[PDB]
């Protein structure tokens, strides 16, 4: 039975992870489909003096105070950290280097989500998405089913632990497209664009803006 | 850690799913033995110069204490260096650059630890690299160092 | 000497369970409400909601 | 004559005693193939070497 405990602790960790990753991928696609996508890949790794954040903040013209966070991968952060290390614009000092702010009062969330990195080497891109209150919605259906089947007939019995559940996710101001998606979408369908219909009349009504950088 | 513990299980489908096994990794700690060459300590030489023969032992222990500590540390540092390299926890800037850059190198080490970059606690190094960073501080192309701030021992990321 | 003697080394079964390494604690307060996790869910593969324009 | 011994362990790394030897010399401690990467994630292993000429 000892294996059950490690299976459980790992399960909990992997379940929280899976839900977060899928939420991040779906949010990125929704913003991209809703036109809340900004590309700084051409302009170097982006986050240049956090002007990329400002350029993405430009999307929310009248009320950019709605976005109050910046979810991103670790690589973009160290790229900005490396930028802070060399103040070509003389805007930083030895002390002001390790900063998690976009100079607009928004924390930069750092997470090694595979849903935030696309491609490898030059093709590798980084999506920094800024979110408003209640931008990404995740609702566990709590329909967890667990049955361990003890495979017999072999020299040694070998249990076969299997667990299944579900969770509803949604994007503020966006609606999933079943025609391009499916009744039970996989991470891919959630991550691919054209799978999100923009409902809010204005973009500022929707919650979230994705900033794609090299 | 069982990889791929969570699959994109979906209804409206019953496709075959491959099975996984539960593995158990093993940790390890080697034992290192050290000794001392026979130290010739005749009392005659000390007596000839009117000295306590016991002084020979006193000086033995005095140096031995420091030497033993040095051996353990040097062995630990060498073992750590090789271990990290073997594990792939290594970044080369000798070919891609020269000496020690202005804390630009430690940023690359942060890339290695990615999300867990904060885990790094210290920067155990040699004297030369520090003087190289001291020179970088004294030659700050980017203006972020003043006369009073060029003797810092920080990596600009809150790490000594 | 030691060659004549037999060493049994040392071993243990800590069974420490390696767990996820990626930071995924980004829900509710962690993201300032940006990404929220709701324990309660809804029925049906879909969950529509008609609101006035 | 003085004699002593001590154990040496690196986080997330298992010494390859098979290659290192029952009593490894300081040259074997630094010798490659004498250390085995354990923690699946490098972030789990503690320490990182930065070679700077």
H or E element in which residue A151 lies? strand A145-151
Residues of B in contact with C19 (CB under 8 A): 1
- The closest CB to that of B86, out of D37, D46, D53, belongs to D37
Distance between CA atoms of residues A160 and B20, nearest Å? 9
What's the burial of D29, exposed, middle or buried (CB within 10 Å: 0-12/13-18/19+)?
Answer: buried
- D interface residues, C as partner, C-beta within 8 Å: 22, 39-41, 43-44
Nearest chain A CA: its distance from B8 CA (Å): 6
Q: How far apart are CA A6 and CA A146, in angstroms?
A: 15
What DSSP designation does C51 have? -
| Helix (H), strand (E) at residue A12 | helix A2-33
Task: Please state, in angstroms and rounded to a whole number, the distance separating the CA atoms of residues A52 and A33.
Answer: 20
Cβ pair C15:B24 closer than 8 A: yes
Read off the tokens for C22.
């990626």
Residue B17 burial by Cβ neighbours in a 10 Å radius (0-12, 13-18, 19+): exposed
Asked if C48 is an interface residue toward chain D (Cβ–Cβ < 8 A), one would say: no
SS3 state of residue D8: strand
Q: To 5 degrees, how large is the angle CA B76–CA B80–CA B86?
A: 145
Are the beta carbons of D25 and D4 closer than 8 angstroms? no
C-beta of residue B117 within 8 angstroms of C-beta of residue A78:
yes
> Do D14 and B93 lie within an 8 Å CB cutoff?
no
A160:B19 CB<8 A:
yes
Query: CB-hemisphere CA count at 13 Å for A190?
Result: 22
Among B75, B37, B34, B71, smallest CA distance to D27 is for: B75
Experimental method: cryo-EM
> In angstroms, how far is CA C13 from the centroid of its own chain?
23
- By C-alpha distance, which of A46, A51, A147, A39 is closest to A91? A51
CA nearest A17: which of A112, A110, A144, A118? A112
Are the C-beta atoms of B158 and A102 separated by less than 8 Å?
no
H or E element at residue A81: helix A74-85
- Residue B15, C-beta contacts closer than 8 angstroms, at least 6 positions apart: none
Helix (H, G, I), strand (E, B) or coil at A129: strand
Taking the C-alpha atoms of residue A130 and residue B112, their distance in angstroms, rounded to an integer, is: 25
Using a CB–CB cutoff of 8 Å, tell me whether C21 touches chain D: yes
| CA separation for the pair B38, D12 (Å, rounded) | 38
Q: What distance in Å separates the CA atoms of residue D29 and residue D17, rounded to the nearest whole number?
A: 10
Contact present, B93 and B101 (Cβ < 8 Å)? yes
What single DSSP character describes residue A107? B
Q: Do C18 and D43 touch (CB under 8 A)?
A: no
- Is there a contact between B129 and B94 (Cβ–Cβ < 8 Å)? no
User: How many angstroms is the resolution?
Assistant: 2.9
**Closest-CA residue to A4 (of A164, A159, A153, A151):** A159
Interchain proximity D45–B86, CB inside 8 Å: no
> For chains B and C, what is the number of CB pairs under 8 angstroms?
15
CB-CB contact of D29 with D4 (8 Å): no
Subunit contact A20:C26, Cβ cutoff 8 A: yes
Residue ranges of alpha helices (H) inside chain B are: 43-48, 54-87, 104-113, 127-138
CB A63 within 8 A of CB A161: no
* A97 C-beta neighbours (distance < 10 Å), count: 23
CA distance B95 to B105: 13
- How many CA atoms lie less than 13 Å away from A91 in the CB half-sphere? 13
Who among B24, B26, B115 is closest to C23 (CB)?
B115
Residues of C near B (CB-CB distance < 8 A)? Answer: 10-11, 14-15, 17-23, 45
Closest residue in chain D to residue C18, using alpha carbons only: D39
What end-to-end distance do the CA atoms of chain B give, in Å? Answer: 32
């Amino acid at each position: 039975q000892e294996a059950g405990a490690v299976i459980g602790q790992q399960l909990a960790g992997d379940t929280m992870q899976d839900m977060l990753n899928n939420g991040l991928a779906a949010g990125k696609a929704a913003f991209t489909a809703g036109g809340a996508v900004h590309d700084i890949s051409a302009a170097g790794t982006g986050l240049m003096t956090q002007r990329a954040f400002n350029a993405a903040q430009r999307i929310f013209g009248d009320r950019s105070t709605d976005i109050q966070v910046w979810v991103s991968h670790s690589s973009p952060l160290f790229d900005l950290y490396d930028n802070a290390l060399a103040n070509a614009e003389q805007l930083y000092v030895f002390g002001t280097v390790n900063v998690r702010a976009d100079a607009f009062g928004r924390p930069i969330i750092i997470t090694d989500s595979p849903a935030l990195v696309s491609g490898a080497a030059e093709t590798l891109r980084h999506s920094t998405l800024g979110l408003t209150t209640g931008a990404i919605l995740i609702e566990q259906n709590q329909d967890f089913d667990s049955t361990v089947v003890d495979g017999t007939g072999k020299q040694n019995i070998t249990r076969q632990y299997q667990a299944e559940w579900s969770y509803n996710l949604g994007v503020n101001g966006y609606a999933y497209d079943i025609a391009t998606g499916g009744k039970a979408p996989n991470p891919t369908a959630l991550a691919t664009a054209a799978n999100w219909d923009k409902i809010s009349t204005s973009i500022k009504d929707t919650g979230g803006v994705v900033l794609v950088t090299k | 850690k069982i990889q791929g513990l969570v699959r994109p299980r979906d209804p409206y489908s019953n496709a075959d799913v491959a099975a996984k096994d539960l593995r158990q990794l093993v940790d390890n700690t080697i034992k290192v033995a050290s000794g001392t060459p026979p130290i010739n300590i005749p009392p005659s030489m000390l007596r000839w110069i009117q000295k306590n023969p016991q002084e020979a032992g006193a000086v033995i222990g005095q140096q031995l204490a420091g030497d033993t500590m040095q051996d353990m540390l040097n062995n630990g540092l060498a073992a750590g260096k090789a271990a990290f390299t073997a594990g792939g926890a290594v970044h080369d800037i000798s070919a891609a650059g020269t000496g020690l850059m202005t804390q630009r190198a430690f940023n690359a080490a942060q890339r290695i630890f990615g999300d867990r970059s904060t885990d790094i606690q210290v920067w155990v190094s040699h004297s030369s690299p520090l003087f190289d960073l001291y020179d970088n501080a004294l030659a700050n192309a980017e203006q972020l160092y003043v006369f009073g701030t060029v003797n810092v021992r920080a990596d600009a990321f809150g790490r000594p | 000497a030691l060659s004549d003697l037999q060493v049994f080394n040392d071993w243990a079964y800590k069974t420490m369970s390696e767990v996820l390494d990626q930071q995924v604690e980004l829900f509710n307060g962690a993201t300032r409400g940006a990404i929220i996790l709701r324990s309660a869910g809804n029925t049906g593969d879909l969950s529509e909601a008609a609101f006035w324009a």
